[PDB]
């Protein structure tokens, strides 16, 4: 043994479960709200189902320049009306 | 008898804490409609 | 001299539940970041602006179709640092430009270095020979040749494999249609090493389990073994007679047997890596010139080699426009190769 | 806790059911409880299928495997396989579901309440695996039960409404079977047919008179053999050829079930008589022949002479000859010319497909049947996207024949592995070296060296 | 991009009258199309006769014209050949032949409109993918 | 000591350099027949009309093949699943044109290899061994049945069985992808884990045992001379190996029981290959890999492509080109 407390000891102790009956659901709900508030879309820049294309276009907003790539994406995002 | 905050404790939680948050994020996605 | 270096050394090498070591300073952050980046990217990040593809759980992909996809072809072989001239510190733009791909690939590469240093480090403390580290050079040779050397020979990172299940399947099929990679003898040797390794694994495991000495009374034979016993738990002599009579030849040197089990899959992976180094330059085993000369002149000459090239040609023409959107291929229906009816 | 740990029994928990080998009373409970599970699934699954069943859709569009079995027996269907009354399906499900509680009850009682061994309690129900006379007597009881079961199919066919006959003149219908085939040259002639293309061994049975008459012979044979094995004990040649132990008897059964699983796989894949395509969808050969038929019909209506249309290879575009001369459909379906089905046979003459019947006698119901089967070919993805592997999403379909064939090949394969596992173990345990080699008595050390 | 009322506006008849479907109608049309039609018409092609597809341009040149709700609803009652010369109810599913095509027995007039609407709207979404076949998959 | 008993004692003798046995009595002639026909056909057989369309494919060395392109070509699609022994042909020339040899080779081979599996059981009984080495061999054996017999059965023709050649194997794999999307099938995926995992654990076990060899030699000699065939004592220190690998991962991820270690080595590739064999055998009945073509749709209804859709494009290329002259109607239903 390496001295840490056995896992089977810890996860059958009431104190473990008093703590983690709160911390586990709290993290789950935090993750749910990251999505349900729509925050995940804006952090990572991921299209919503209604923002892949403009209403009549069918071309991909594909990046084609290396050093103006950032401006190209910003331009594609404006053209969504 | 035993400590509470060890290296093992940190290793466990750097993995377990984001896992639960991600599981909740992915569960919410199952209700997104187009 | 018991300075801070030696005190630090003491703490790093404590016998804990997770050994750390000096190698752990490199291994743990890079491994964790490479895994966390793959999970973050496959859960939340799109491939719309680099590939025209949805690629995350957020967008409705499943475990088989999510990926962290390669950057756009226009990025070349850019390191794509978050603070570099493309993303310019913008975390959201960085994600849209494919910065997670180089992030995962580069932290992964240094993470692999760290795991192999860990194998050396632990082996030196325990006092065993470092053959486990030596065997791990083959996964490193594969990772480096496929994820780094190969795109570096090509036009850009875009043509490297993307980190996802179905994305890797597309990589396999791209290699058939464009490189005729099944024809390549360096791939053939790798196939031999992988399948011969799985064979050796199966047959050595089964031979040991069916030449066990009766060292206990229970019908479960697992208990009748003690890690510190001095005797072999199975009969090498009965194993040797069985295979000599079933197969003609058999192992007789148990040390040779286990070195061979190291040798076969490791040599395989190394051979496959060399062939991919060639594909970095399109230096393919694509054709047999003698077959092409005969087939060009003799329209009744047909082999399974000529049949497969026709499949490759179908793969290239039908997948290229969608798989290489930056090229802007417009192939009218009338130019597409097709058999009758289909 | 008699034999309920590894120390007493010698078997670890993951081989825990091996602890039951010499506890006939608990072993009885395990077997009865398990039969209850089988009867439960049959009843519950039927009710699930019925609840999910829309009578206006073909059964094969709805993921049904049990209702097709009931409909084939003549319950709930009329001409053309149309569903006329879903009540028999309800009955069959409810009665299996109710019976599973009786079996569950007995199984749980014997397993945990009743006597652990039966030999002290009753010498009739008690048994010793090594008692060759008692084992063949139990075997004989079960052969008599099996024989009665086969006669129940005969009784349904001849006295209680009949069977669904896909070949019946007029599009398929329930028909009473009045003259079952009894000529043993016909019945046993099926057993000596080659299993290869155009012959098909017993999978080729193609009429109900043969099916019914074959069950008369099997019924009598089982009853007789059951009487024989009650009255006899194994002969000397048999005594010396077998291993006589519980695990050995298990292994023989596993081999038998594997064999049957593989046969069932082919039956459901090729046979369209006892697996009617009205209920199960067309076979693979059937849908492929149906495509050729559909395009022959379309092109002929446009004015093509399909008899003389030369295809790109030099073979006929629509029609060609089989290797023995029969006129057959062309294209890649040339491999399926052994297909026989009620919608196609009116076009058949002595030489195969008859060009005069093709030109003049193709009825709209045949065009309908062929277009339906061509678009319900047993191709489809694991997530039930119907069609070739390159098809887009839209059609939620996988043929019942694909579900039934794949599941039973997988089951049959693992049951062959289980036969090898337990037959090899039974041999080793009987001879006494199933736990390893005795160090002081290692046989190979007493043998001359090979070189 | 979004499923807007403009997308959902389609010709009602040959005289130029339009009708605007609801999202619920369009989605009901898609479900009913999969139920009754997609086994031969998946993607707007025709598996048992690929010469005829469900592209609006093809439907416009049918006789009588089928590129509007009334024409398509009439086709599902009494289908004809492309030139109108023959009645094909005996080999094509329709209300007239619901006895031999049982899936048509539980379609109502309101269902036919929804299916018709699906067929007219999908090309406006999918472009060439509708009726294009494998080349555009 | 009558003559039958004498023959039986020779057949089952544990003293023959190669064990014969009762399975060997079927094995030896069927494997000889298949081997001799294979070698002759591989060198000298004339071209074969595999797809039944009078378009013969050349497989042998004398007709323009090298080792990589050569094959014994599967029998004609016109034959389908019909039995075609030499005596069903009007001449040897007919038999050869129609791919007769393929049927003779694979039927003798499948018989012989099945008996090779029983022979493994049989000798283990004569030597007092445990009986399950043959269970491990059932996984490669089942794979051979899948591609030479089961897949032809479900598809209706031996012409879609795997060719007996290197490039022929590749052709089989490519068309299999087009028609079943085998990459997207979980059983092929388990097969890959079976053989990738099998190769990993092979190098793993070999490197750990080699790392903990007990010093018995000088540096000028091979360490392999430190083990002597038949010796009573183990040649490496499994406790040192466990102590290394336990610290590499964590202590409880490491085996210290050699018997369950070696059981794990046996089970992982064998179970994985069983699933691979069951993938081929179930796709034989057209229950194909996952289809996510056009699964992701935007708000308006535009198709949003995934990597699955790029795979589909590649599959379509393989589909439209394979057997370019053999289809007259639009659906490749078998
Ligand atoms: C073994 C264990 C190892 C353990 C893992 C180690 C992990 C370390 C990670 C290091 C990552 C290295 C990143 C290299 C990026 C790169 O290369 O980036 C590539 C750049 C060159 O950039 C490329 O240059 C190309 C050529 O352009 C040139 O030509 C153009 C067209 O004519 C124009 O004229 C243009 O102006 C001119 O620059 C194109 O422009 C490409 O788009 C552009 O990406 O080189 C450079 O950064 C530097 C080039 C010199 C150093 C190369 C040595 C290292 C790589 C060796 C691999 C050999 C590969 C050959 C194929 C086999
Ligand atoms: C004790 C062991 C002893 C061993 C004995 C060895 C002797 C030979 C073994 C048999 C070899 C079989 C090879 C051919 C199998 C086959 O082509 O099977 C097909 C036949 C069915 O034949 C088909 O039968 C059809 C009959 O349908 C006809 O009749 C129907 C009537 O409804 C329809 O009308 C239909 O349209 C019409 O065509 C046609 O004739 C077809 O042409 C014909 O191909 O199946 C059948 O006979 C029955 C199924 C046989 C079992 C299938 C083999 C599976 C083996 C798996 C082993 C795995 C091992 C793993 C190792 C680890
Ligand atoms: C069909 C599946 C099946 C069946 C019928 C059995 C049956 C049996 N097992 Mg086996 N076993 C199985 C699967 C099965 N097993 C599996 C999957 C494993 C691996 C985990 C094992 C591992 C195993 C071990 C290690 C052992 C057994 C033993 C036994 C026997 C005694 C069990 C006991 O005393 O429990 C007592 C348990 C209870 C009293 C708790 C509840 C039990 C009841 C029956 C639950 C049923 C509830 C049901 C819904 C009620 C319906 C009632 C209604 C009809 C009125 C019994 C005959 C034992 C044995 O061999 O004894 C000699 C034994 O040691 N089994
Ligand atoms: C009617 C058929 C039958 C019967 C009565 C037996 C009976 C027995 N077997 Mg045998 N066996 C069989 C078929 C059968 N087997 C088949 C078909 C195979 C091939 C796979 C085997 C392979 C086999 C092996 C390798 C061994 C046995 C052993 C045994 C003995 C102990 C079994 C036990 O307690 O398992 C306990 C049950 C479990 C531990 C549970 C297994 C869980 C399975 C794998 C899950 C399967 C997945 C499921 C189908 C779907 C997924 C579910 C999930 C999504 C929830 C017992 C005498 C042991 C023995 O030799 O004793 C003498 C032994 O070592 N069997
Ligand atoms: C003979 C077996 C069999 C067959 C051929 C079918 C066939 C079918 N079922 Mg039924 N069913 C069965 C048994 C079977 N079922 C059982 C045992 C249950 C209770 C769990 C059900 C309960 C059920 C429900 C509730 C439903 C169906 C439905 C269906 C239809 C769709 C199937 C599907 O999409 O699966 C999806 C595919 C899978 C889930 C793949 C499973 C992979 C398994 C886990 C692999 C196991 C391998 C092996 C056994 C383990 C070996 C381990 C090794 C170590 C030895 C199809 C007609 C559906 C339907 O359409 O009803 C009308 C439906 O809703 N079935
Ligand atoms: C094959 C299954 C089977 C077998 C071999 C046995 C055998 C036995 N049972 Mg068990 N049992 C079973 C199933 C079985 N049972 C079922 C399904 C139940 C729930 C009903 C029970 C509930 C049960 C209880 C509560 C008791 C037993 C007892 C016994 C012992 C004495 C029985 C006797 O002498 O009856 C004499 C014979 C008869 C009374 C004739 C019965 C005829 C049946 C009821 C009519 C149907 C016959 C026909 C073949 C059924 C076809 C069913 C098929 C469609 C599934 C004997 C060892 C006794 C025991 O263990 O003593 C300690 C005891 O107390 N059994
Ligand atoms: C579940 C059903 C069943 C089982 C398990 C048994 C089991 C037994 N029977 Mg019984 N028997 C049965 C049903 C059964 N029988 C029926 C229904 C009848 C009436 C026909 C008989 C009539 C009968 C007689 C007259 C005798 C037995 C005997 C025996 C014993 C010897 C078995 C043997 O050596 O077979 C091995 C099989 C053979 C030796 C057959 C020849 C070998 C050929 C070449 C194998 C061919 C395999 C091939 C793949 C076939 C595929 C299908 C084929 C039709 C084309 C054994 C205990 C013997 C005994 O000891 O009686 C006391 C005996 O003399 N049985
Ligand atoms: C296969 C059994 C089919 C089913 C199910 C459905 N359709 Fe069909 N359709 C089919 C064929 C063979 C044809 C051509 C018929 C001919 O000979 O002209 C058609 C044609 C149509 C058309 C006309 C297309 C055009 O003129 O371009 C329409 C509008 C049509 N079909 C609609 C339709 C609907 C709405 C269906 C579900 C109720 C349906 N079809 C099913 C074959 C099959
Ligand atoms: C990138 C990046 C970063 C990082 C991040 C991180 C680090 C993250 C992490 C993350 C994580 C860490 C996550 C996780 C997740 C997890 C998950 C999501 C899981 C899931 C699972 C499941 C689902 C399971 C399943 C299963 C299996 C697998 C088998 C068994 C059975 C079962 C079924 C259970 C930073 C910030 C630095 C910077 C920027 C960039
Ligand atoms: C021994 C043992 C075991 C086993 C057990 C078993 C196997 C049991 C079975 C059991 C069973 C097998 C049971 C059954 C039951 C049943 C029931 C209980 C039923 C009921 C029914 C009902 C109530 C019905 C109803 C209805 C109607 C009538 C109408 C329609 C609708 C409905 C459905 C509602 C185990 C493994 C656990 C382990 C331990 C030992
Ligand atoms: C119902 C029906 C029918 C009929 C049927 C019949 C009549 C059947 C019979 C069957 C039979 C009649 C079968 C048999 C079988 C047998 C077997 C399967 C056997 C086996 C054997 C064995 C296994 C052996 C083994 C061995 C050897 C070889 C050596 C020595 C040792 C031993 C013993 C191990 C028909 C088709 C008409 C139609 C449909 C329905
Ligand atoms: C980079 C690390 C180089 C070690 S540096 C070294 O560290 C010692 C601590 O033991 C000090 O006592 C000493 O002054 C210092 O030179
Ligand atoms: Cl065709």
């Amino acid at each position: 043994t390496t001295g840490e407390r056995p896992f089977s000891d810890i996860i059958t102790s009431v104190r473990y479960w008093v703590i983690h009956s709160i911390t586990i659901p709290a993290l789950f709900i935090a993750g749910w709200l990251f999505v349900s508030t729509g925050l995940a879309y804006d952090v990572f820049g991921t299209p919503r189902p209604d923002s892949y294309y403009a209403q009549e276009q069918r071309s991909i907003p594909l990046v084609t320049d290396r050093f103006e790539a950032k401006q190209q994406v910003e331009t594609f995002l404006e053209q969504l009306k | 008898s035993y400590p509470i905050f060890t290296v093992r404790w940190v290793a466990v939680h750097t993995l377990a804490v984001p896992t639960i948050f991600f599981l909740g994020a992915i569960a919410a996605m199952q209700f997104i409609q187009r | 001299e018991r300075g801070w270096f030696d005190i630090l050394d003491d703490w790093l090498k404590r016998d804990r539940f997770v050994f750390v070591g000096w190698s752990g300073i490199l291994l743990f952050p890079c491994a964790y970041l490479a895994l966390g980046g793959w999970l973050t990217g496959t859960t939340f990040v799109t491939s719309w602006y680099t590939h025209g593809l949805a690629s995350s759980y957020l967008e409705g992909c499943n475990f088989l179709t999510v990926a962290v996809s390669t950057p756009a072809n226009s990025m070349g072989h850019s390191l794509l640092l978050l603070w570099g001239p493309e993303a310019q510190g913008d975390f959201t733009r960085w994600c849209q430009l494919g910065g997670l791909w180089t992030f995962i690939a580069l932290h992964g590469a240094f993470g692999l270095i760290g795991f192999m240093l860990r194998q050396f480090e632990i082996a030196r403390l325990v006092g065993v020979r470092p053959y486990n580290a030596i065997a791990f050079s083959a996964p490193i040779a594969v990772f480096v040749s496929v994820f780094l050397i190969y795109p570096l020979g090509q036009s850009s990172w875009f043509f490297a494999p993307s980190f996802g299940v179905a994305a890797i399947f597309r990589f396999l099929l791209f290699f058939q249609g464009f490189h005729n990679w099944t024809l390549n003898p360096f791939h053939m040797m790798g196939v031999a090493g992988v399948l011969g390794g799985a064979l050796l694994c199966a047959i050595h495991g089964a031979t040991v389990e069916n030449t066990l000495f009766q060292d206990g009374e229970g019908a479960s034979t697992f208990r009748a073994f003690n890690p510190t016993q001095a005797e072999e738990t199975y009969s090498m002599v009965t194993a040797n007679r069985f295979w000599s009579q079933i197969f003609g030849i058999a192992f007789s040197n148990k040390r040779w047997l286990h070195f061979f089990m190291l040798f076969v899959p490791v040599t395989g992976l190394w051979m496959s890596a060399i062939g991919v180094v060639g594909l970095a330059l399109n230096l393919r085993s694509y054709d047999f010139i003698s077959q092409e000369i005969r087939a060009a002149e003799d329209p009744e000459f047909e082999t399974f080699y000529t049949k497969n090239l026709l499949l490759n040609e179908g793969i290239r023409a039908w997948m290229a426009p969608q798989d290489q959107p930056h090229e802007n291929f417009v192939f009218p229906e009338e130019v597409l190769p097709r058999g009758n009816a289909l | 806790a008699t034999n309920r740990d590894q120390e007493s029994s010698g078997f670890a928990w993951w081989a825990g059911n091996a602890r039951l080998i010499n506890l006939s009373g608990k072993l009885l409970g395990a077997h009865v409880a398990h039969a209850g599970l089988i009867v439960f699934w049959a009843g519950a699954m039927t009710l699930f299928e019925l609840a999910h069943f829309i009578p206006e859709k073909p059964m094969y569009e709805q993921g049904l495997i049990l209702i097709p079995h009931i409909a084939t027996l003549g319950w709930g269907v009329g001409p053309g396989g149309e569903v006329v009354d879903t009540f028999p399906f309800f009955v069959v499900g409810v009665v299996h579901l109710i019976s599973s509680a009786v079996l569950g009850f007995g199984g749980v009682y014997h397993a945990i309440r009743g006597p652990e061994t039966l030999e002290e309690y009753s010498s009739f129900f008690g048994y010793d695996w090594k008692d060759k006379n008692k084992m063949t007597t139990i075997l004989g009881f079960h052969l008599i039960v099996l024989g009665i079961g086969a006669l129940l199919l005969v009784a349904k066919a001849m006295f209680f409404g009949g069977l669904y006959d896909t070949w019946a003149p007029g599009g398929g219908d329930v028909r009473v079977i009045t003259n079952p085939t009894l000529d043993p040259r016909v019945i046993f002639g099926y057993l000596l047919k080659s299993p290869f293309g155009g012959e098909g061994w017993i999978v080729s049975v193609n009429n109900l008179e043969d099916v019914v008459g074959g069950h008369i012979w099997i019924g009598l044979i089982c009853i007789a053999g059951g009487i024989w094995h009650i009255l006899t004990t194994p002969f000397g040649w048999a005594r010396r050829a077998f291993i006589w132990s519980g695990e050995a008897y298990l292994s023989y059964s596993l081999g038998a079930l594997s064999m049957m699983g593989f046969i069932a796989t082919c039956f459901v894949w090729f046979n369209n008589t006892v697996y009617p395509s009205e209920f199960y969808g067309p076979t693979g050969p059937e849908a492929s022949q149906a495509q050729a038929m559909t395009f022959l019909i379309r092109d002929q209506k446009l004015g093509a002479n399909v008899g003389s249309a030369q295809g790109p290879t030099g073979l006929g575009k629509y029609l060609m000859r089989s290797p023995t001369g029969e006129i057959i459909f062309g294209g890649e379906t040339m491999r399926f010319w052994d297909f026989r089905g009620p919608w196609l046979e009116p076009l058949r003459g002595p030489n195969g497909l008859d060009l005069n019947k093709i030109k003049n006698d193709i009825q709209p119901w045949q065009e309908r049947r062929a277009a339906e089967y061509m678009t319900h070919a047993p191709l489809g993805s694991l997530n039930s996207v119907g069609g070739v592997a390159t098809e887009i999403n839209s059609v939620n379909f996988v043929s019942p024949r694909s579900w039934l064939a794949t599941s039973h090949f997988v089951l049959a394969f693992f049951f062959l592995v289980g036969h090898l596992w337990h037959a090899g173990r039974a041999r080793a345990a009987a001879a006494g070296f199933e736990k390893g080699i005795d160090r002081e008595s290692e046989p190979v050390l007493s043998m001359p060296s090979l070189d | 991009a979004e499923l807007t009322p403009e997308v959902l506006t389609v010709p009602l008849n040959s005289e130029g009258k339009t009708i605007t479907l609801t999202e619920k109608q369009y989605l009901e049309g898609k479900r009913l199309f999969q139920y009754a039609c997609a086994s031969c018409h998946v993607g707007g092609i025709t598996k048992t006769n690929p010469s005829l597809d469900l592209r609006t341009e093809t439907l416009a040149l049918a006789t009588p014209p089928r590129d509007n709700i009334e024409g398509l609803v009439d086709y599902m009652k009494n289908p004809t050949t492309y030139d109108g010369e023959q009645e094909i109810a005996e080999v094509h599913p329709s209300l007239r032949s619901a006895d031999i095509f049982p899936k048509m027995r539980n379609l109502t007039e309101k269902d036919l409109v929804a299916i018709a609407g699906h067929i007219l709207v999908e090309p406006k979404i999918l472009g060439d993918k509708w009726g294009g076949g494998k080349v555009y998959y | 000591a009558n003559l039958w008993e004498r023959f039986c004692n020779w057949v089952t003798s544990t003293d023959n350099r190669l064990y014969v046995g009762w399975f060997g009595v079927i094995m030896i002639p069927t494997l000889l027949a298949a081997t001799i026909c294979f070698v002759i056909a591989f060198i000298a057989a004339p071209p074969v009309d595999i797809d039944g369309i009078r378009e013969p494919v050349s497989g042998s060395l004398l007709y323009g093949n090298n080792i990589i392109t050569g094959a014994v070509v599967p029998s004609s699609n016109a034959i389908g699943l019909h039995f075609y022994p030499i005596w069903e042909a009007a001449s040897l020339d007919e038999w050869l044109y129609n791919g007769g040899p393929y049927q003779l080779i694979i039927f003798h081979f499948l018989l012989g290899a099945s008996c090779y599996m029983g022979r493994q059981w049989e000798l283990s009984y004569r030597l007092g061994m445990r009986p399950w080495i043959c269970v491990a061999y059932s996984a490669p054996l089942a794979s051979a049945f899948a591609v030479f017999l089961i897949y032809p059965i479900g598809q209706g023709s031996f012409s879609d069985g795997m060719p007996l050649g290197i490039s022929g194997t590749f052709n089989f794999m490519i068309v299999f992808q087009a028609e079943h999307n085998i990459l997207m099938h979980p059983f092929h995926q388990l097969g890959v884990a079976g053989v990738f995992g099998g190769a990993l654990f092979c190098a793993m076990h070999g490197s750990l045992v080699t790392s903990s060899l007990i010093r018995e030699t000088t540096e000028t000699e091979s360490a392999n001379y430190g083990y002597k065939f038949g010796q009573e004592e183990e040649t490496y220190n499994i406790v040192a190996a466990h102590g290394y690998f336990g610290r590499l991962i964590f202590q409880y991820a490491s085996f210290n029981n050699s018997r369950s270690l070696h059981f794990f080595l046996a089970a992982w590739p064998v179970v994985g290959v069983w699933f691979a064999a069951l993938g081929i055998s179930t796709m034989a009945f057209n229950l194909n890999g996952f289809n996510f073509n056009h699964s992701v749709i935007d708000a308006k209804g535009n198709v949003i492509n995934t990597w699955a859709d790029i795979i589909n494009r590649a599959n379509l290329g393989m589909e439209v080109m394979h057997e370019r002259n053999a289809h007259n109607f639009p659906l490749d239903l078998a």
Side-chain angles (χ1 to χ4, degrees), chain C residues 145-146 150-151 154 159-161 168-183 187 275-277 279-280 284 286 312 315 319:
Chain C
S145 74
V146 175
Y150 173 78
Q154 294 290 343
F159 288 105
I168 277 288
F169 298 157
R170 162 270 173 198
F171 192 74
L172 307 181
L173 306 179
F174 184 96
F175 265 52
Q176 180 51 53
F178 287 85
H179 295 302
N180 209 7
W181 172 232
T182 40
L183 204 69
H187 187 245
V276 170
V277 170
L279 297 185
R284 308 152 175 168
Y286 190 83
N312 295 339
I315 290 166
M319 91 171 284

Side-chain angles (χ1 to χ4, degrees), chain F residues 179-190:
Chain F
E179 296 181 356
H180 305 286
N181 202 356
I182 175 164
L183 289 178
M184 292 290 285
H185 198 289
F187 280 12
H188 179 267
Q189 295 160 8
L190 286 166

Side-chain angles (χ1 to χ4, degrees), chain E residues 1-3 125 134-135 137, chain F residues 294 299-302 313 316 319:
Chain E
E2 178 59 279
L3 194 64
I125 299 169
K134 72 183 68 188
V135 166
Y137 281 7
Chain F
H294 302 189
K300 182 179 172 186
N302 297 297
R313 294 305 299 184
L316 285 169
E319 162 179 318

Side-chain angles (χ1 to χ4, degrees), chain C residues 210-223 229 231-233 235 237-238 241 244-245 340, chain D residues 6-7 9-12 14 312 425 432-439 442-445 447-450:
Chain C
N210 288 270
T211 58
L212 298 172
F213 289 116
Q214 177 168 17
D215 286 335
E217 308 289 337
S220 167
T221 58
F222 296 100
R223 303 205 136 170
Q229 74 188 57
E231 323 86 57
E232 53 174 12
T233 192
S235 176
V237 167
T238 289
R241 197 192 184 90
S244 306
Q245 291 188 277
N340 199 57
Chain D
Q6 185 173 8
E7 343 298 319
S9 73
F11 286 107
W14 42 263
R425 200 190 183 278
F433 43 75
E434 93 277 0
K435 293 165 182 175
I437 292 159
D438 176 24
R439 292 183 181 263
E442 178 170 4
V444 155
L445 298 183
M447 292 171 191
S449 103
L450 296 168

